[PDB]
Design a protein around this ligand. Structure first.
Ligand SMILES: N#Cc1ccc(COC[C@H]2O[C@@H](n3c(NCc4ccc(Cl)c(Cl)c4)nc4c(N)ncnc43)[C@H](O)[C@@H]2O)cc1
Length: 539
């Protein structure tokens, strides 16, 4: 009946469903609300989820994980080549694509990353079906905001292979914002910072929500920073302590290191709520029992550099979004590692004591929002687009930013581009792209009779006026003569849907770097030509 929302993560995945007016995070066959993104191949069977991770020490060369780091990418990507050196399983090239290679029932088998992701999605689908007691078909799957079209199509194909109808691919930070209802808040546009610290990845996203529209302003972070690194800091600390007390290095014994790491991770999770935790391991190495403790302050000291360095991607995302820290309206914690009190204190002090949105389980908020969006897609006055004019080089110069309260009036001064320019062609465009090629022409009019003058000397005042009904009047005045011209543009008729605005905003997101590189190509910013650039001859 209902559609599910799936957070397909690198190490863990989550599935939720909106029923009875409530989002429910679905527990698996072992009772866990999150399922490891592991696929294991043995002599007899294919294990997925908890069963696959529970035997990783026994079958490490045939237990696949972190397949999300490969999906949508080609084999010769530097990211893939760098990640291959850290995995116990083999990665091979097949016509320019990476594949994981394992042994299964005594035969060598290779799978594309989307195939392993399809196995994980099959597990999540079966979990949802066991919970709901019916076949689940429609689903919303989330991806990192920095995913390109290829990676998103690969994730959708992974969904399709698993028998899922992928209604839509949405961004994980957007899903986290939807779970908190930040798109349903009253007032002007809101700036949202999603701080996502999981088991092995760290993602900072800066979005702007305006009239229910999500625009990804910036993304940053560290693809190899998570709770596993904190566990490893603890493990090295305790190995040093054991070597210092009992004069023995336990690094030689793999099982001792495994037991120590499990104890350290559990003690870390304890330290999120207590100021100290105990480590009790019987016969850790050479019969010696290891019974010790660790304070929260010592744990923070062991991870001081990583904890404090989480703030640098925040600064980078703020700079790339052209926003001050005080301009952020909402802060959303996602990922289990955000339960660490020192991380929360660092983030809150950085924002001068602002409260953090953390009431939703940070391991489940992405699947929460995905389920909300799946239920929406299954059944559950401001300006819509930026308005501007074409300036020299055919670039878009915006006078009324998107999501501006009407009625409004905005005036800007422009000038001529060539010497002795007799007139200017005011060309009104609507869109979120830097070049007028990729925007929508609404109208144009000419302003002639400009007295001969050098370039940059004449002054042309251009005014955009939007009344309460949305009727757009654009006027141009020669400031040296008072001569004027104008045009009226009917901004009505329901010509745009919410999906149209979302598509235009996401296309502006996709070509952000090229739009920036071509916007600053022209030297002057308020120079008007006399012709239409998009109708000029080019090779
Ligand atoms: N069951 C279960 C389960 C639930 C969620 C996750 C995902 O966790 C990913 C990252 O989140 C880390 N983490 C988590 N993870 C949530 C979690 C909850 C319960 C269990 Cl049994 C486990 Cl072990 C993990 N809690 C933390 C905490 N309280 N303090 C510091 N770090 C915590 C976790 O150690 C890892 O670094 C993994 C397992």
């Amino acid at each position: 009946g209902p559609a599910v929302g799936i957070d397909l993560g690198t190490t863990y995945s989550c599935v939720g469903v909106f029923q009875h007016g409530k989002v429910e995070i679905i527990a698996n066959d072992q009772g866990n609300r999150t399922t490891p993104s592991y696929v294991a191949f043995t002599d007899t069977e294919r294990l997925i989820g908890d069963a696959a991770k529970n035997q990783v020490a026994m079958n490490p060369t045939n237990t696949v994980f972190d397949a999300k780091r490969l999906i949508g990418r080609r084999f010769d990507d530097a990211v893939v080549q760098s990640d291959m050196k850290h995995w116990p399983f083999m990665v091979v090239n097949d016509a320019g694509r990476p594949k994981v290679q394992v042994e299964y029932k005594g035969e060598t088998k290779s799978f594309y990353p989307e195939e392993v992701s399809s196995m994980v999605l099959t597990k999540m689908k079966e979990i949802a079906e066991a919970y709901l007691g019916k076949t689940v078909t429609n689903a919303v799957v989330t991806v990192p905001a920095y995913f390109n079209d290829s990676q998103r199509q690969a994730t959708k194909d992974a969904g399709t292979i698993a028998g899922l109808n992928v209604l839509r691919i949405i961004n994980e930070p957007t899903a986290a914002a939807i779970a908190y209802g930040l798109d349903k808040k009253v007032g002007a546009e809101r700036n949202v910072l999603i701080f996502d610290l999981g088991g092995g990845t760290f993602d900072v996203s800066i979005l702007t929500i305006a009239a229910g529209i999500f625009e990804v302003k910036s993304t940053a972070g560290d693809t190899h920073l998570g709770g596993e690194d904190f566990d490893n800091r603890m493990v090295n600390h305790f190995i040093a302590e054991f070597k210092r007390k009992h004069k023995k290095d336990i690094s030689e014994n793999k099982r001792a290191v495994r037991r120590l790491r499990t104890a350290c991770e559990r003690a870390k999770r304890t330290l999120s709520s207590s100021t100290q935790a105990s480590i009790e391991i019987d016969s850790l190495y050479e019969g010696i029992d290891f019974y010790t403790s660790i304070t929260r302050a010592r744990f923070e000291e062991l991870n001081a550099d990583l904890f404090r360095g989480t703030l640098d991607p925040v600064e980078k995302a703020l700079r790339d979004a052209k926003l001050d820290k005080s301009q952020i309206h909402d802060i959303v914690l996602v990922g289990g590692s955000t339960r660490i009190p020192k991380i929360q204190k660092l983030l809150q002090d950085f924002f001068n004591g602002k409260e953090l949105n953390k009431s939703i389980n940070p391991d489940e908020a992405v699947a929460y929002g995905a389920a909300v969006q799946a239920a929406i897609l299954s059944g559950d006055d401001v300006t819509p687009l930026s308005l501007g004019i074409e300036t020299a080089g055919g670039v878009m110069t915006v006078l009324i930013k998107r999501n501006t309260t009407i009625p409004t009036k905005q005036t800007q001064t422009f000038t001529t581009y060539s010497d002795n320019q007799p007139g200017v062609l005011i060309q009104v465009y609507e869109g979120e792209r830097a070049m007028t090629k990729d925007n929508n022409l609404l109208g144009k009019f000419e302003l002639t009779g400009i007295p001969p003058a050098p370039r940059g000397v004449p002054q042309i005042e251009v005014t955009f006026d939007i009344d309460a009904n949305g009727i757009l009047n654009v006027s141009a005045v020669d400031k040296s003569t008072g001569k004027e011209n104008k045009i009226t543009i009917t901004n009505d008729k329901g010509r745009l849907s919410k999906e149209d605005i979302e598509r235009m905003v996401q296309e502006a997101e996709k070509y952000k770097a090229e739009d920036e590189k071509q916007r600053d190509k022209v030297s002057s910013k308020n120079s008007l030509e006399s012709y239409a650039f998009n109708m000029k001859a080019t090779v």
